[PDB]
């Protein structure tokens, strides 16, 4: 298919995006498209724990209602994550 | 008079019995008692994991 593998190529090519990284449910790197490897390795380990911890937050308040999309916003950067059961998509977009 | 004394002590005027008691043989044994092994367990419970 062109459709997932093209959209993922499109959001990378898109201006003011550092890189898109797919995390496996077992905290593993399927695709990692950042500049420096330290950042990509760091993002691969650190962020999927925040999303699991942030999933337990929304879950406690209402255990029917599951996480569909998490967006953190830092001083310099934004961090946006779209979690699913099979895979999790992560991006880092610099604020305009 | 000495012979007469020896002559006074007979076989049917001074029998000579042997007697001992039954003594169990002493024996030295070791017994080490170590209690059941004690394993660390770590469990977390959240409202969702209960409900799930």
DSSP string for residues in A52-87: HHHHHHHHHH-TT---S-EEEE-SSEEEEEEE-SSE
**A69 contact partners, CB below 8 Å, separation of at least 6:** A80, A81, A82, A83
- Experimental method for this entry? cryo-EM
A7, A27, A42, B38 from A72: Cα distances, Å: 22, 19, 17, 43
Mutation target to probe the A interface, by most A beta carbons within 10 A, among B47, B50, B52 is B47
H/E stretch holding B48 = helix B47-51
Tell me if A60 and B47 make a contact (CB, 8 A cut-off). Answer: yes
From CA A92, how far away is CA A39, in angstroms rounded?
11
Reported residue count of chain B is 52
- Long-range pairs of A5-10 with CB within 8 A, sequence gap ≥ 24: none
A22, A25, A31, A41 from A49: Cα distances, Å: 14, 11, 18, 14
**Resolution in units of Å:** 8.0
Contacts of A56 in chain B (CB under 8 A): 46, 48
Contact yes or no for A67/A58 (Cβ under 8 A): yes
**How crowded is residue A79: how many other Cβ atoms within 10 Å of its Cβ?**
17
Mutation target to probe the B interface, by most B beta carbons within 10 A, among A49, A53, A56 is A56
Contacts of B47 in chain A (CB under 8 A): 59-60, 63
Contact yes or no for A22/A87 (Cβ under 8 A): yes
φ/ψ bin of A27: left (φ > 0), alpha (ψ from -120 to 50), beta (otherwise): left
CB contact B48 to A (< 8 Å):
yes
* Per-residue tokens: A27: 């905290």
Instruction: Burial-class residue A21 by CB neighbours within 10 Å (0-12, 13-18, 19+).
Output: buried
Question: What pairs with residue A72 in β-bridges?
Answer: A79
Question: What pairs with residue A80 in β-bridges?
Answer: A71, A91
Contact yes or no for A72/A85 (Cβ under 8 A): no
**How crowded is residue A18: how many other Cβ atoms within 10 Å of its Cβ?**
19
**Nearest-CA distance from A64 to chain B in Å?**
9
């Amino acid at each position: 298919m062109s459709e997932v593998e093209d959209t993922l190529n499109r959001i990378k090519t898109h201006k003011t995006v550092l890189g898109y990284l797919i995390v496996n449910s077992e905290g593993g790197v399927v695709r990692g498209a950042f500049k420096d490897e330290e950042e990509s390795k760091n993002i691969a380990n650190s962020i999927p724990l925040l999303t699991k911890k942030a999933r337990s937050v929304v879950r406690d308040l209402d255990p029917t209602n599951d996480l569909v999309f998490l967006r953190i916003q830092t001083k310099l950067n934004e961090i946006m994550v779209a979690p699913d059961d099979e895979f999790s998509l992560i991006v880092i977009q610099t604020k305009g | 008079e000495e012979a007469i004394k020896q002559t006074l002590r007979n076989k049917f005027n001074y029998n000579t019995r042997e007697c001992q008691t039954i003594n169990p043989s002493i024996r030295e044994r070791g017994v080490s008692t170590e209690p059941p092994p004690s394993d660390t367990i770590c469990g977390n419970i959240t409202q969702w994991e209960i409900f799930d």
